[PDB]
Amino acid sequence: MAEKPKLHYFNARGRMESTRWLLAAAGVEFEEKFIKSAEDLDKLRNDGYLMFQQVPMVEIDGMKLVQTRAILNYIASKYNLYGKDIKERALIDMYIEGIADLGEMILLLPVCPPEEKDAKLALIKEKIKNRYFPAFEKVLHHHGQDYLVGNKLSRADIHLVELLYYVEELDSSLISSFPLLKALKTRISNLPTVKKFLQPGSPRKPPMDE
Amino acid sequence: MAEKPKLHYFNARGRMESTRWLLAAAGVEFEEKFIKSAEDLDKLRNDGYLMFQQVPMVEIDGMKLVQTRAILNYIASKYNLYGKDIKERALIDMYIEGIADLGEMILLLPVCPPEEKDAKLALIKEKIKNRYFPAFEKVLHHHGQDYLVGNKLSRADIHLVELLYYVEELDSSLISSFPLLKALKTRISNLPTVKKFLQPGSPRKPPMDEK
């Protein structure tokens, strides 16, 4: 009756990559079904597989889940990565929605024309240095613990470290004045499930033009 | 301590209105502290009240919560409006993230120039009639029950009916072919907590072209 979740998306990062990270960190093997044409997406739509006619969609535990946050919230709860109580979940949600805001800026960074790419990249770097990285460094500095919330691995650590890898692709110097973020990146990357995902041949997807 | 949540935002709907709806529907009295100037927002920032230097912020249960979804998820769980288990939450989350997508289109609808307002409104109406309203009408039709999930009031019913009022403001005819959505709107609007919120004098905020 099927055990591997099935990920319906493109052979690309896009809006599915944070789900790939979370499942891989939880040690969950999954299947991917790549959209490669208009007819592939039209088939999913006509078959009634997409509640709002869009992907990402994940087949898991008998459901056809769409909307990235619905998918991620279910996976996080199922694999005990969403905190131990609703107050831990509140901190996790606050942290990861800030991460989502920065991640969306990076996802939608224009490539063309060059003067627009340059202008938007400059603003993103300002926000990374002055808003987002200080906020997360401060959480880690305030409790001195190895993880963001509850002194235990959660999805917040996984989502943040994923973002740290994208920020490194934009500008490797941006993390340099944030030693607790660098230490978190190292600690999470050394977890055996995450280290496997970082190896060649994993489902981790490459950048578009980096 | 401080039994009433405190909502920090502008005296406007914006990104705080769905929290006002949810707290009011849950029967929870709250306080508001309105940002009326740049100085107000700067004071919140320099006092360390805003994790990412932005509002909405809600003071609740000893936390200074920012990010609308963090605020709403916590309130929904605290007041037992988030279903009974992980699978019900998956359905709720699916539904309300679709609601959030349509709500965002409406929130960001331009007013100017008129031909652009008209063009993007025409796109929103086509998605309401062809994508979003059919999807929620099918949910109610499939199980035949009074509420979206679990045969019991949840945040999904509250968030959907809120959005039904905004769609009504855009075009009162868009719901006409969706009888189950109309019946849900009437049912939720007649719940005593929601009916009270719909009265003049409640914390419900007006549309911007009126304030």
Residue numbers in the entry:
A (entry chain D): 1 to 210
B (entry chain C): 1 to 211
The authors write:
Glutathione transferases (GSTs) are promiscuous enzymes whose main function is the detoxification of electrophilic compounds. The isoenzyme hGSTA1-1 is primarily expressed in the human liver but can also be found in various other human tissues. It is a key enzyme in human physiology, since it is involved in the phase II detoxification mechanism of a wide range of electrophilic compounds, such as drugs, carcinogenic metabolites, and environmental pollutants. Cytosolic GSTs are dimeric enzymes with each subunit having two distinct domains: a conserved N-terminal thioredoxin-like α/β domain and a C-terminal α-helical domain.
